[PDB]
PDB file of C-alpha atoms in Angstrom:
ATOM      1  CA  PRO D   1       0.000   0.000   0.000  1.00 19.54           C
ATOM      2  CA  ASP D   2       3.141   2.281   0.143  1.00 15.91           C
ATOM      3  CA  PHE D   3       4.725   1.925  -3.405  1.00 15.85           C
ATOM      4  CA  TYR D   4       2.943   1.409  -6.830  1.00 16.47           C
ATOM      5  CA  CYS D   5       3.900  -0.499 -10.030  1.00 18.89           C
ATOM      6  CA  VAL D   6       4.217   1.163 -13.494  1.00 16.41           C
ATOM      7  CA  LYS D   7       2.552  -0.441 -16.611  1.00 20.82           C
ATOM      8  CA  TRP D   8       4.476   0.936 -19.644  1.00 20.22           C
ATOM      9  CA  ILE D   9       2.148   0.873 -22.650  1.00 16.45           C
ATOM     10  CA  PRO D  10       2.308   2.166 -26.244  1.00 13.81           C
ATOM     11  CA  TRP D  11      -0.525   4.778 -26.394  1.00 16.20           C
ATOM     12  CA  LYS D  12      -1.435   7.709 -28.733  1.00 14.39           C
ATOM     13  CA  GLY D  13       1.880   7.472 -30.652  1.00 14.31           C
ATOM     14  CA  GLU D  14       4.622   6.970 -28.037  1.00 11.60           C
ATOM     15  CA  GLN D  15       5.448   4.707 -25.017  1.00 13.96           C
ATOM     16  CA  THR D  16       3.346   6.165 -22.117  1.00 14.35           C
ATOM     17  CA  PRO D  17       3.540   5.144 -18.395  1.00 13.85           C
ATOM     18  CA  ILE D  18       0.437   4.243 -16.168  1.00 18.73           C
ATOM     19  CA  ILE D  19      -0.145   3.194 -12.443  1.00 20.67           C
ATOM     20  CA  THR D  20      -1.560  -0.140 -11.051  1.00 20.94           C
ATOM     21  CA  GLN D  21      -3.453  -0.423  -7.688  1.00 20.93           C
ATOM     22  CA  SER D  22      -3.164  -4.048  -6.337  1.00 17.74           C
ATOM     23  CA  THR D  23      -4.435  -3.188  -2.760  1.00 16.20           C
ATOM     24  CA  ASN D  24      -7.646  -1.711  -4.387  1.00 19.21           C
ATOM     25  CA  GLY D  25      -8.491   0.892  -1.653  1.00 17.27           C
ATOM     26  CA  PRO D  26     -10.734   4.011  -1.720  1.00 17.94           C
ATOM     27  CA  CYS D  27      -7.695   5.087  -3.913  1.00 19.37           C
ATOM     28  CA  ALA D  28      -8.358   8.070  -6.237  1.00 21.39           C
ATOM     29  CA  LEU D  29      -4.798   9.414  -6.775  1.00 20.40           C
ATOM     30  CA  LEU D  30      -3.903   6.399  -9.043  1.00 19.21           C
ATOM     31  CA  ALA D  31      -7.259   7.241 -10.863  1.00 21.15           C
ATOM     32  CA  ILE D  32      -6.456  11.026 -11.395  1.00 21.77           C
ATOM     33  CA  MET D  33      -2.643  10.840 -11.732  1.00 24.14           C
ATOM     34  CA  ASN D  34      -3.194   8.105 -14.422  1.00 22.04           C
ATOM     35  CA  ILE D  35      -5.129  10.645 -16.570  1.00 21.62           C
ATOM     36  CA  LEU D  36      -2.243  13.168 -16.347  1.00 22.43           C
ATOM     37  CA  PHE D  37       0.322  10.560 -17.632  1.00 20.96           C
ATOM     38  CA  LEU D  38      -1.943   9.748 -20.644  1.00 21.88           C
ATOM     39  CA  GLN D  39      -2.447  13.496 -21.255  1.00 22.42           C
ATOM     40  CA  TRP D  40       1.463  13.478 -20.919  1.00 23.98           C
ATOM     41  CA  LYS D  41       0.965  16.343 -18.344  1.00 25.91           C
ATOM     42  CA  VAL D  42       3.506  14.329 -16.180  1.00 27.30           C
ATOM     43  CA  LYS D  43       6.429  12.554 -18.001  1.00 26.52           C
ATOM     44  CA  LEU D  44       8.333   9.633 -16.288  1.00 24.13           C
ATOM     45  CA  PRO D  45      11.885   8.439 -17.075  1.00 23.46           C
ATOM     46  CA  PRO D  46      11.424   5.411 -19.431  1.00 23.43           C
ATOM     47  CA  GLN D  47      13.478   3.470 -16.789  1.00 23.77           C
ATOM     48  CA  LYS D  48      10.861   3.850 -13.947  1.00 21.15           C
ATOM     49  CA  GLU D  49       9.488   0.433 -12.731  1.00 19.58           C
ATOM     50  CA  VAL D  50       7.946   1.953  -9.520  1.00 20.25           C
ATOM     51  CA  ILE D  51       6.621   5.147  -7.881  1.00 19.36           C
ATOM     52  CA  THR D  52       5.536   6.249  -4.337  1.00 19.32           C
ATOM     53  CA  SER D  53       2.437   8.025  -2.915  1.00 19.33           C
ATOM     54  CA  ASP D  54       5.184  10.678  -2.227  1.00 18.03           C
ATOM     55  CA  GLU D  55       6.343  10.894  -5.914  1.00 16.04           C
ATOM     56  CA  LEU D  56       2.711  10.799  -7.209  1.00 13.39           C
ATOM     57  CA  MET D  57       1.619  13.447  -4.647  1.00 13.07           C
ATOM     58  CA  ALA D  58       4.321  16.150  -5.338  1.00 11.55           C
ATOM     59  CA  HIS D  59       3.802  15.503  -9.128  1.00 11.44           C
ATOM     60  CA  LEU D  60       0.116  16.530  -8.726  1.00 13.33           C
ATOM     61  CA  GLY D  61       0.858  19.649  -6.628  1.00 17.37           C
ATOM     62  CA  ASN D  62       3.296  21.056  -9.221  1.00 19.20           C
ATOM     63  CA  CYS D  63       0.602  20.119 -11.796  1.00 17.92           C
ATOM     64  CA  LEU D  64      -2.245  21.977  -9.910  1.00 20.64           C
ATOM     65  CA  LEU D  65       0.012  25.003  -9.080  1.00 19.52           C
ATOM     66  CA  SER D  66       0.946  25.240 -12.798  1.00 20.14           C
ATOM     67  CA  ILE D  67      -2.731  26.047 -13.671  1.00 19.93           C
ATOM     68  CA  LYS D  68      -3.037  29.705 -14.805  1.00 24.55           C
ATOM     69  CA  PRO D  69      -6.769  30.633 -14.466  1.00 24.01           C
ATOM     70  CA  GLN D  70      -9.531  30.758 -17.178  1.00 18.92           C
ATOM     71  CA  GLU D  71     -11.128  34.231 -16.435  1.00 20.60           C
ATOM     72  CA  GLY D  72     -17.312  30.692 -13.579  1.00 19.98           C
ATOM     73  CA  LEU D  73     -14.231  30.887 -11.253  1.00 16.45           C
ATOM     74  CA  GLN D  74     -12.659  34.472 -11.280  1.00 16.36           C
ATOM     75  CA  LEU D  75     -10.898  35.273  -7.916  1.00 14.75           C
ATOM     76  CA  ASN D  76     -13.358  32.452  -6.964  1.00 19.34           C
ATOM     77  CA  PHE D  77     -10.548  30.357  -8.668  1.00 18.87           C
ATOM     78  CA  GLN D  78      -7.849  31.826  -6.335  1.00 16.37           C
ATOM     79  CA  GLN D  79      -9.719  30.160  -3.346  1.00 13.08           C
ATOM     80  CA  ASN D  80     -10.645  27.009  -5.419  1.00 16.54           C
ATOM     81  CA  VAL D  81      -6.775  26.574  -5.550  1.00 16.05           C
ATOM     82  CA  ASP D  82      -6.154  27.197  -1.801  1.00 18.24           C
ATOM     83  CA  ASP D  83      -9.099  24.795  -1.006  1.00 14.31           C
ATOM     84  CA  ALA D  84      -7.647  21.978  -3.182  1.00 12.29           C
ATOM     85  CA  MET D  85      -3.895  22.587  -2.431  1.00 16.27           C
ATOM     86  CA  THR D  86      -4.722  22.181   1.301  1.00 16.92           C
ATOM     87  CA  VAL D  87      -6.910  18.971   1.047  1.00 16.58           C
ATOM     88  CA  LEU D  88      -4.406  17.709  -1.630  1.00 16.01           C
ATOM     89  CA  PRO D  89      -2.499  15.417   0.772  1.00 18.81           C
ATOM     90  CA  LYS D  90      -5.904  13.851   1.753  1.00 19.14           C
ATOM     91  CA  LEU D  91      -5.937  11.900  -1.626  1.00 21.46           C
ATOM     92  CA  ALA D  92      -2.975   9.725  -0.401  1.00 21.67           C
ATOM     93  CA  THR D  93      -5.060   7.887   2.283  1.00 20.27           C
ATOM     94  CA  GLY D  94      -8.532   8.017   0.670  1.00 16.74           C
ATOM     95  CA  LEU D  95     -11.616  10.211   0.309  1.00 18.17           C
ATOM     96  CA  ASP D  96     -15.381   9.589   0.772  1.00 21.37           C
ATOM     97  CA  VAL D  97     -17.726  11.482  -1.528  1.00 20.99           C
ATOM     98  CA  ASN D  98     -21.370  12.152  -0.703  1.00 19.81           C
ATOM     99  CA  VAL D  99     -22.910  11.033  -4.043  1.00 16.43           C
ATOM    100  CA  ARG D 100     -26.229  12.702  -4.995  1.00 17.06           C
ATOM    101  CA  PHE D 101     -28.826  10.591  -6.935  1.00 15.95           C
ATOM    102  CA  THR D 102     -30.252  13.495  -9.056  1.00 12.65           C
ATOM    103  CA  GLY D 103     -27.586  13.347 -11.838  1.00 14.35           C
ATOM    104  CA  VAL D 104     -24.175  11.710 -12.657  1.00 13.86           C
ATOM    105  CA  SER D 105     -22.199  14.988 -12.055  1.00 13.53           C
ATOM    106  CA  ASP D 106     -24.218  15.680  -8.838  1.00 16.80           C
ATOM    107  CA  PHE D 107     -22.391  15.387  -5.425  1.00 17.38           C
ATOM    108  CA  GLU D 108     -22.337  17.284  -2.068  1.00 15.24           C
ATOM    109  CA  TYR D 109     -19.269  19.562  -2.420  1.00 15.34           C
ATOM    110  CA  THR D 110     -16.261  18.143  -0.523  1.00 13.98           C
ATOM    111  CA  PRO D 111     -13.298  20.593  -0.816  1.00 10.45           C
ATOM    112  CA  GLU D 112     -11.479  17.551  -2.415  1.00 10.77           C
ATOM    113  CA  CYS D 113     -14.048  18.010  -5.239  1.00 13.13           C
ATOM    114  CA  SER D 114     -11.942  21.206  -5.892  1.00 10.20           C
ATOM    115  CA  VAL D 115      -8.971  19.168  -7.382  1.00  7.08           C
ATOM    116  CA  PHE D 116     -11.100  17.906 -10.332  1.00  4.44           C
ATOM    117  CA  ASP D 117     -13.062  21.228 -10.533  1.00  6.47           C
ATOM    118  CA  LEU D 118      -9.542  22.717 -11.171  1.00  3.87           C
ATOM    119  CA  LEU D 119      -7.845  20.065 -13.427  1.00  2.00           C
ATOM    120  CA  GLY D 120     -10.723  20.203 -15.977  1.00  4.02           C
ATOM    121  CA  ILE D 121     -11.384  16.511 -15.125  1.00  2.00           C
ATOM    122  CA  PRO D 122     -15.045  15.431 -14.858  1.00  2.00           C
ATOM    123  CA  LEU D 123     -16.178  13.152 -11.997  1.00  2.00           C
ATOM    124  CA  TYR D 124     -19.239  10.895 -12.551  1.00  2.00           C
ATOM    125  CA  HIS D 125     -21.064   8.138 -10.563  1.00  2.00           C
ATOM    126  CA  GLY D 126     -23.597   5.478 -11.660  1.00  2.00           C
ATOM    127  CA  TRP D 127     -25.819   5.448  -8.535  1.00  2.00           C
ATOM    128  CA  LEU D 128     -28.863   7.254 -10.052  1.00  2.00           C
ATOM    129  CA  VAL D 129     -32.550   6.829  -9.032  1.00  2.00           C
ATOM    130  CA  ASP D 130     -34.890   5.477 -11.800  1.00  2.00           C
ATOM    131  CA  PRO D 131     -37.681   7.915 -12.930  1.00  2.00           C
ATOM    132  CA  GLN D 132     -39.058   4.500 -14.182  1.00  2.00           C
ATOM    133  CA  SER D 133     -40.000   4.064 -10.453  1.00  2.00           C
ATOM    134  CA  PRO D 134     -42.100   6.995  -9.025  1.00  2.00           C
ATOM    135  CA  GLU D 135     -41.654   6.442  -5.232  1.00  2.00           C
ATOM    136  CA  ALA D 136     -37.854   7.048  -5.409  1.00  2.00           C
ATOM    137  CA  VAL D 137     -38.160  10.422  -7.295  1.00  2.00           C
ATOM    138  CA  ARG D 138     -40.413  11.559  -4.331  1.00  2.00           C
ATOM    139  CA  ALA D 139     -38.958   9.297  -1.551  1.00  2.00           C
ATOM    140  CA  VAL D 140     -35.258  10.238  -2.206  1.00  2.00           C
ATOM    141  CA  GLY D 141     -35.500  13.732  -3.784  1.00  2.00           C
ATOM    142  CA  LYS D 142     -32.163  15.630  -4.002  1.00  2.00           C
ATOM    143  CA  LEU D 143     -30.819  13.900  -0.830  1.00  2.00           C
ATOM    144  CA  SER D 144     -27.289  12.309  -0.744  1.00  2.00           C
ATOM    145  CA  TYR D 145     -26.273   8.763   0.553  1.00  2.00           C
ATOM    146  CA  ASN D 146     -24.734  10.328   3.712  1.00  2.00           C
ATOM    147  CA  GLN D 147     -27.881  12.564   4.092  1.00  2.00           C
ATOM    148  CA  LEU D 148     -30.374   9.770   3.222  1.00  2.00           C
ATOM    149  CA  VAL D 149     -28.909   7.548   5.996  1.00  2.00           C
ATOM    150  CA  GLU D 150     -29.302  10.480   8.518  1.00  2.00           C
ATOM    151  CA  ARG D 151     -32.933  10.799   7.234  1.00  2.00           C
ATOM    152  CA  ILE D 152     -33.923   7.034   7.151  1.00  2.00           C
ATOM    153  CA  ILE D 153     -32.922   6.871  10.888  1.00  2.00           C
ATOM    154  CA  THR D 154     -35.181   9.931  11.591  1.00  2.00           C
ATOM    155  CA  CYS D 155     -38.162   8.200   9.802  1.00  2.00           C
ATOM    156  CA  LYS D 156     -37.662   4.888  11.723  1.00  2.00           C
ATOM    157  CA  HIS D 157     -38.537   7.019  14.850  1.00  2.00           C
ATOM    158  CA  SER D 158     -41.270   9.480  13.614  1.00  2.00           C
ATOM    159  CA  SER D 159     -44.679   8.376  15.042  1.00  2.00           C
ATOM    160  CA  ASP D 160     -46.227   9.172  11.595  1.00  2.00           C
ATOM    161  CA  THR D 161     -46.137   6.363   8.920  1.00  2.00           C
ATOM    162  CA  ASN D 162     -46.817   9.174   6.379  1.00  2.00           C
ATOM    163  CA  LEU D 163     -42.970   9.764   6.753  1.00  2.00           C
ATOM    164  CA  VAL D 164     -42.011   6.169   7.917  1.00  2.00           C
ATOM    165  CA  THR D 165     -43.537   5.009   4.578  1.00  2.00           C
ATOM    166  CA  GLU D 166     -40.776   7.074   2.899  1.00  2.00           C
ATOM    167  CA  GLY D 167     -38.242   5.700   5.496  1.00  2.00           C
ATOM    168  CA  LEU D 168     -39.132   2.140   4.405  1.00  2.00           C
ATOM    169  CA  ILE D 169     -39.114   2.912   0.612  1.00  2.00           C
ATOM    170  CA  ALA D 170     -35.673   4.597   0.807  1.00  2.00           C
ATOM    171  CA  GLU D 171     -34.365   1.463   2.673  1.00  2.00           C
ATOM    172  CA  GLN D 172     -35.599  -0.341  -0.511  1.00  2.00           C
ATOM    173  CA  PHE D 173     -33.564   1.937  -2.849  1.00  2.00           C
ATOM    174  CA  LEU D 174     -30.259   0.909  -1.090  1.00  2.00           C
ATOM    175  CA  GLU D 175     -30.837  -2.711   0.164  1.00  2.00           C
ATOM    176  CA  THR D 176     -31.716  -3.122  -3.611  1.00  2.00           C
ATOM    177  CA  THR D 177     -29.486  -0.808  -5.813  1.00  2.00           C
ATOM    178  CA  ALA D 178     -26.520  -1.871  -3.572  1.00  2.00           C
ATOM    179  CA  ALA D 179     -23.958  -2.029  -6.457  1.00  2.00           C
ATOM    180  CA  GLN D 180     -23.463   1.722  -6.636  1.00  2.00           C
ATOM    181  CA  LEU D 181     -24.872   1.769 -10.231  1.00  2.00           C
ATOM    182  CA  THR D 182     -28.371   1.388 -11.844  1.00  2.00           C
ATOM    183  CA  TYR D 183     -29.065   0.487 -15.520  1.00  2.00           C
ATOM    184  CA  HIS D 184     -30.593   4.063 -15.595  1.00  2.00           C
ATOM    185  CA  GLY D 185     -27.415   5.737 -14.220  1.00  2.00           C
ATOM    186  CA  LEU D 186     -25.262   3.702 -16.648  1.00  2.00           C
ATOM    187  CA  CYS D 187     -27.328   4.855 -19.700  1.00  2.00           C
ATOM    188  CA  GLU D 188     -27.617   8.526 -18.496  1.00  2.00           C
ATOM    189  CA  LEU D 189     -23.780   8.422 -17.880  1.00  2.00           C
ATOM    190  CA  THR D 190     -23.056   7.677 -21.593  1.00  2.00           C
ATOM    191  CA  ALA D 191     -25.466  10.573 -22.347  1.00  2.00           C
ATOM    192  CA  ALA D 192     -23.414  13.265 -20.493  1.00  2.00           C
ATOM    193  CA  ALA D 193     -20.077  11.528 -21.392  1.00  2.00           C
ATOM    194  CA  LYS D 194     -18.014  13.263 -24.187  1.00  2.00           C
ATOM    195  CA  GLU D 195     -16.204  10.742 -26.519  1.00  2.00           C
ATOM    196  CA  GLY D 196     -12.417  10.152 -26.157  1.00  2.00           C
ATOM    197  CA  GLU D 197     -11.866  12.729 -23.281  1.00  2.00           C
ATOM    198  CA  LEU D 198     -10.814  10.982 -19.990  1.00  2.00           C
ATOM    199  CA  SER D 199     -12.793  11.289 -16.711  1.00  2.00           C
ATOM    200  CA  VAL D 200     -13.161   9.557 -13.262  1.00  2.00           C
ATOM    201  CA  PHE D 201     -15.857   7.114 -12.054  1.00  2.00           C
ATOM    202  CA  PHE D 202     -17.033   6.570  -8.419  1.00  2.00           C
ATOM    203  CA  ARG D 203     -18.453   3.210  -7.186  1.00  2.00           C
ATOM    204  CA  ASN D 204     -18.485   1.399  -3.758  1.00  2.00           C
ATOM    205  CA  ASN D 205     -16.120   4.072  -2.282  1.00  2.00           C
ATOM    206  CA  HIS D 206     -13.671   3.184  -5.137  1.00  2.00           C
ATOM    207  CA  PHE D 207     -12.242   5.288  -8.046  1.00  2.00           C
ATOM    208  CA  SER D 208     -11.604   4.418 -11.740  1.00  2.00           C
ATOM    209  CA  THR D 209     -10.152   6.220 -14.833  1.00  2.00           C
ATOM    210  CA  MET D 210     -12.848   6.390 -17.631  1.00  2.00           C
ATOM    211  CA  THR D 211     -13.722   7.251 -21.288  1.00  2.00           C
ATOM    212  CA  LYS D 212     -16.461   6.785 -24.052  1.00  2.00           C
ATOM    213  CA  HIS D 213     -14.923   5.333 -27.302  1.00  2.00           C
ATOM    214  CA  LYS D 214     -17.093   4.628 -30.369  1.00  2.00           C
ATOM    215  CA  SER D 215     -20.013   5.760 -28.084  1.00  2.00           C
ATOM    216  CA  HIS D 216     -19.502   2.917 -25.478  1.00  2.00           C
ATOM    217  CA  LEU D 217     -17.995   3.565 -21.923  1.00  2.00           C
ATOM    218  CA  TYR D 218     -14.561   1.847 -21.399  1.00  2.00           C
ATOM    219  CA  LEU D 219     -12.566   2.133 -18.078  1.00  2.00           C
ATOM    220  CA  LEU D 220      -8.791   1.506 -17.506  1.00  2.00           C
ATOM    221  CA  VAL D 221      -7.007  -1.652 -16.188  1.00  2.00           C
ATOM    222  CA  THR D 222      -5.746  -0.239 -12.814  1.00  2.00           C
ATOM    223  CA  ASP D 223      -5.534  -3.975 -11.715  1.00  2.00           C
ATOM    224  CA  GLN D 224      -1.812  -4.869 -11.228  1.00  2.00           C
ATOM    225  CA  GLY D 225      -2.434  -8.465 -12.426  1.00  2.00           C
ATOM    226  CA  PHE D 226      -2.579  -7.783 -16.206  1.00  2.00           C
ATOM    227  CA  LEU D 227       0.845  -6.105 -16.266  1.00  2.00           C
ATOM    228  CA  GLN D 228       3.202  -7.462 -19.031  1.00  2.00           C
ATOM    229  CA  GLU D 229       0.089  -7.221 -21.270  1.00  2.00           C
ATOM    230  CA  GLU D 230       0.572  -3.914 -23.163  1.00  2.00           C
ATOM    231  CA  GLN D 231      -2.462  -4.877 -25.345  1.00  2.00           C
ATOM    232  CA  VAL D 232      -4.628  -5.315 -22.187  1.00  2.00           C
ATOM    233  CA  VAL D 233      -5.478  -1.619 -21.643  1.00  2.80           C
ATOM    234  CA  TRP D 234      -9.304  -0.971 -21.348  1.00  2.00           C
ATOM    235  CA  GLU D 235     -12.148  -2.991 -19.708  1.00  2.00           C
ATOM    236  CA  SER D 236     -15.776  -2.291 -20.850  1.00  2.00           C
ATOM    237  CA  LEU D 237     -18.720  -0.687 -19.033  1.00  2.00           C
ATOM    238  CA  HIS D 238     -20.961  -1.815 -21.953  1.00  3.83           C
ATOM    239  CA  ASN D 239     -23.196  -3.651 -19.341  1.00  6.62           C
ATOM    240  CA  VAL D 240     -25.351  -3.008 -16.156  1.00  3.85           C
ATOM    241  CA  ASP D 241     -23.431  -6.086 -14.804  1.00  2.00           C
ATOM    242  CA  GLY D 242     -21.857  -9.280 -16.250  1.00  2.00           C
ATOM    243  CA  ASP D 243     -18.489  -9.663 -18.074  1.00  2.00           C
ATOM    244  CA  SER D 244     -16.261  -7.265 -20.101  1.00  2.00           C
ATOM    245  CA  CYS D 245     -14.032  -7.516 -23.251  1.00  2.00           C
ATOM    246  CA  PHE D 246     -10.399  -6.171 -22.996  1.00  3.69           C
ATOM    247  CA  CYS D 247      -8.569  -3.995 -25.603  1.00  2.65           C
ATOM    248  CA  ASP D 248      -5.207  -2.444 -26.645  1.00  2.13           C
ATOM    249  CA  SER D 249      -4.869   1.419 -26.637  1.00  2.00           C
ATOM    250  CA  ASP D 250      -6.514   1.591 -30.133  1.00  2.00           C
ATOM    251  CA  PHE D 251      -9.600  -0.275 -28.662  1.00  2.00           C
ATOM    252  CA  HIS D 252      -8.915  -3.550 -30.537  1.00  2.00           C
ATOM    253  CA  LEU D 253      -9.766  -6.769 -28.563  1.00  2.00           C
ATOM    254  CA  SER D 254      -6.892  -8.770 -26.925  1.00  2.00           C
ATOM    255  CA  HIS D 255      -6.482 -12.250 -25.324  1.00  2.00           C
ATOM    256  CA  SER D 256      -4.042 -13.386 -22.545  1.00  2.00           C
TER     257      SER D 256
END
């Protein structure tokens, strides 16, 4: 959990490095930092076999601090920086996000949110309510999965089944849509999702590098296991659940 292993993969023309989580924690630095290496925003000596939470960290800070501003955020930006810079070292350990269920770019604002909101990197999650189920739209509203828990516990105690009825039928929406994704979220995600531009995906307090390529949603292979395999580069999110096909950089299929 201290060091990290480099996959070294031919991508977009040249030999490009990438990082592999084996521990598989609430680990979002590997997920962001990855993006930067692809974007070639951070170059690594061709040599490098390994890298530390230390290396990765300081690499990101020089990368954030090298953002000159774009006129939304004006001197609002100047605090967006301070916010992020300060909760930067947080990313090393891990970071909960309060996911909203309204939309796939909808969260309660952590100040760790500010790192993405500054690196022009989108964050998305799959855990959306289904307007193809009316009770949720009403019985969940704009509440978040840290604010819905607080609320379900309030309803379990209200002597008024008018608002226990909700408190039951929220308990449904979790003790069912456990996998933090719905078919609905998954579809709606591809909707928002710009082709070919890389992003980050939240699920079960766990972070993934993402993209849409030929209008399907393919993630990266942050798994250390498939490691000598340069051609094994993207897994699919073609499906609500099941199995996924693997690819080389150019999104051609590959086999062990």
